[PDB]
Amino acid sequence: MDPNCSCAAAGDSCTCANSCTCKACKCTSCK
């Protein structure tokens, strides 16, 4: 369930290099 952003999990491999989805991503790959 991706509400606004389900990244910054530390360890896991988020996919913010292809196409971001989070509505409120805070990853350095999408500011």
Ligand SMILES: [Cd+2]
């Ligand atoms: Cd990410």
Ligand SMILES: [Cd+2]
């Ligand atoms: Cd992102």
Ligand SMILES: [Cd+2]
């Ligand atoms: Cd995110």
